[PDB]
């Protein structure tokens, strides 16, 4: 149980990630995570980015873990685990579209 359900849901795909995101009631900045069904079973970091000029939407950052290091949505910034990178991404965008699930969504 890395976090709980703010930036990570579990073993979800991009169809639900975009759904739950635009169907949960959370505001943009909701960087959800989930296992990628593209490979044997990698990870992912979906993100809700609705806008006041187009409607709601949801992008995604395929998460991958190198056995030579740890995790990384982009090869420019890896970490040791999903909780450790959600830790760095929380105080920093990490280089992607931005940080991860907002801490004070309220």
């Amino acid at each position: 149980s890395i976090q709980a359900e703010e930036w990570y849901f579990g073993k979800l795909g991009r169809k639900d990630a975009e759904r739950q995101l635009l169907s949960f009631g959370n505001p943009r900045g909701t960087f959800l995570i989930r296992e990628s069904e593209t490979t044997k079973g990698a990870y992912s970091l979906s993100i809700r980015d609705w806008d006041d000029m187009k409607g709601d939407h949801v992008k995604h950052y395929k998460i991958r873990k190198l056995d030579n290091g740890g995790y990384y949505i982009t090869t420019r910034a890896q970490f040791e685990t999903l909780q450790q990178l959600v830790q760095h991404y929380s105080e920093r965008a990490a280089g992607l579209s931005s940080r991860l699930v907002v801490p004070s969504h309220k």
Partner: peptide
């Protein structure tokens, strides 16, 4: 870009 977005893209 195709596939998941990637921070890097230039050469």
């Amino acid at each position: 870009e195709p596939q998941y977005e990637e921070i890097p893209i230039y050469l």
